[PDB]
């Protein structure tokens, strides 16, 4: 056969030699070379010793300063959290795995891995809708001045977690389930088995349609719009040129956080999807492992685009470290 | 300078030599080589001697036959019309142009060219929404059985023309305007000049947002969905396998008419857009001419995808010509 199905796992390696061991009992060294299983550990070790400070620091250059309290400093201080939940919640429990070539903590771990990745990913796709909608109600402003108050900011921030849990938690109680992917060292929604005691095929397309399509239809719609105004719906709507440089410094950043999201995450999907529909067609333990581990940088790059494309945040962040000021 | 603006035209060639003539008074042979202006004529002559029968024939294999009366035979018998409006309404008035190297009929023609192209394109982008929504209410069917009758079919067919005229007619009365593109032998909405006596900048993004973005957001949303069911939302919703081959023979075609639309039309946009925002940056008479003439095949290929991907239609179409039956 192609893979070797079990009670709670699936793998791209034929038990036609009877070698296959379940990814919860013994090493999966029979999938790739033992020099690679360490490579993951090293990569996963780098993102742990890189995501911890550049997200704890952004989760701190805000809590201290005062003038840093607008809709943007909120969403990027919210990623400052969702991401650290990725590191100690997921990455600690994922690096540790590769060093062993297979999960050890019992499936009672492939829940923190697969949960704290799906979670950090969803709080990052939805936090982008609340950011587009924000760029939309600021770039080509609609009606009366119910101007965003620190208030509606929380409303959208408490919004991402909620929505982001509608995708991640369901499979944690029994609406799908987290199972080992590619090399059995990265767990994600069971796009693998057809199982029926969790309606696997339902939750899966549920997840995809409200936490991929929709999430986007709101971003794309508010995308172009972030261009009508950076032109004529602005000449008539009179906008001082001392604001079409900051308010655009942000229309640019938001615009690069969206692309940045489609570069990193789309790939994992390219495979997660091909998997689902073409179930039963031989593939290896690298067909879903790169996209996974690659896309897994979803908890590192945002605080960066943010120090490299947002001066205000950057002049303060350099004021914190250097003590006093610059 | 870059181009040589006039009262009702715009061109990518510097009057820094004083050569430039208006695309409504004398030949524009000074933009490309006179061997090319004929090339357009020949290309435009081929699509005229190719789109006339394969659209008059589909606009006839339906009007006669009886068993050809369902939502799909309607939308593809509607393109059978919008397209012939492209040929004699637009192409006759556009081939004739290139043989002369510049418009002759007076701008009182760059209205039929630029109108009967925008029109044929809008009756084809919207007829795809009415086709996705249809695949959507048939692939992952919603509730109670109000199963469409020939009725709602017209509702959506009378729908495309209406919506498609919201894009094309406006510029014809004074909300934008049709002006010569690239080689002054293909007219399209004025993505060129900033003008103000037609609010050029408003209509343009209007046209883009409701006749590009939206039109798609309905197609894309109904796209994936055309996959939930071609899987599990169909096992529980019990669908005989003698229908999951015709009803899918159509989920495939519709799916190839959407890709086919993004291959052909997207390019013209890629430039029409870069033009608008980057107004004033030198470019030539080929930067907007290929996409235009290329994408201009939007009145030829659908009746084809239709004879090559829909057997019923094809077995009858071959029955008409061969007289009697096969
Ligand atoms: C490193 C391990 C990972 C990334 C494991 C699992 C990931 C998911 C279940 C991801 C889900 C998705 C997200 C967060 C965003 C785009 C759509 C998606 C379904 C692939
Ligand atoms: C050959 C000449 C042509 C195609 C001239 C003009 C075309 C337009 C004004 C096209 C408009 C568009 C359509 C039909 C569909 C996609 C979006 C669009 C605005 C480019
Ligand atoms: C095949 O794999 C299974 C489950 O992973 C294992 O228990 C079994 O012993 C292998 N086949 C045989 C014939 O031993
Ligand atoms: C430049 O172009 C214009 C109009 O297209 C033409 O009328 C004019 O005569 C040319 N320049 C000169 C100096 O003649």
Curated annotation (Swiss-Prot), chains A, B:
The modification N6-(retinylidene)lysine is found at residue 296. The keyword Metal-binding applies. A lipid is attached at residues 322-323 (S-palmitoyl cysteine). Phosphorylated on some or all of the serine and threonine residues present in the C-terminal region. It is a multi-pass membrane protein. The keyword Disulfide bond applies. GO terms for biological process: absorption of visible light; cellular response to light stimulus; detection of temperature stimulus involved in thermoception; G protein-coupled opsin signaling pathway; G protein-coupled receptor signaling pathway; gene expression; microtubule cytoskeleton organization; photoreceptor cell maintenance. Glycans are attached at residues 2, 15. A motif ('Ionic lock' involved in activated form stabilization) lies at residues 134-136. PANTHER family: OPSIN. This is Rhodopsin. It comes from Bos taurus (Bovine).
């Amino acid at each position: 056969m192609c893979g070797t199905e079990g009670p709670n796992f699936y793998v791209p390696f034929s038990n036609k030699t009877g070698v296959v061991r379940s990814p919860f009992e013994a090493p999966q060294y029979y999938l790739a070379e033992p020099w690679q299983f360490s490579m993951l550990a090293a990569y996963m070790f780098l993102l742990i010793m890189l995501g911890f400070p550049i997200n704890f620091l952004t989760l701190y250059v805000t809590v201290q300063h005062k003038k840093l309290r607008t809709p943007l400093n909120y969403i990027l201080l919210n990623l400052a959290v969702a991401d650290l939940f990725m590191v100690f919640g997921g990455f600690t429990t994922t690096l540790y795995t590769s060093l062993h070539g297979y999960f050890v903590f019992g499936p009672t771990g492939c829940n923190l891995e697969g949960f704290f990745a799906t979670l950090g990913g969803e709080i990052a796709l939805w936090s982008l809708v609340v950011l587009a909608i924000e760029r939309y109600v600021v770039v080509c402003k609609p009606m009366s001045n119910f101007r965003f108050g620190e208030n509606h900011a929380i409303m959208g921030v408490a919004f991402t977690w909620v929505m982001a849990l509608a995708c991640a938690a369901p499979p944690l109680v029994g609406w799908s389930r987290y199972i080992p992917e590619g090399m059995q060292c990265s767990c994600g929604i069971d796009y693998y088995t057809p199982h029926e005691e969790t309606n696997n095929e339902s939750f899966v397309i549920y997840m995809f349609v409200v936490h991929f399509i929709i999430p986007l239809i709101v971003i794309f719609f508010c995308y172009g719009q972030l261009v009508f105004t950076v032109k004529e719906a602005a000449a008539q709507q009179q906008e001082s040129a001392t604001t079409q440089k900051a308010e655009k410094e942000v229309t640019r950043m938001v615009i690069i956080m969206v692309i940045a999201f489609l570069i990193c995450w789309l790939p994992y999907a390219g495979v997660a999807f091909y998997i689902f529909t073409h179930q039963g067609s031989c593939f290896g333990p690298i067909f879903m492992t790169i996209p996974a581990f690659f896309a897994k940088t979803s908890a590192v790059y945002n605080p960066v685009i943010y120090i490299m494309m947002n001066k205000q945040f950057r002049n303060c962040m350099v004021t914190t470290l250097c003590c006093g000021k610059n």
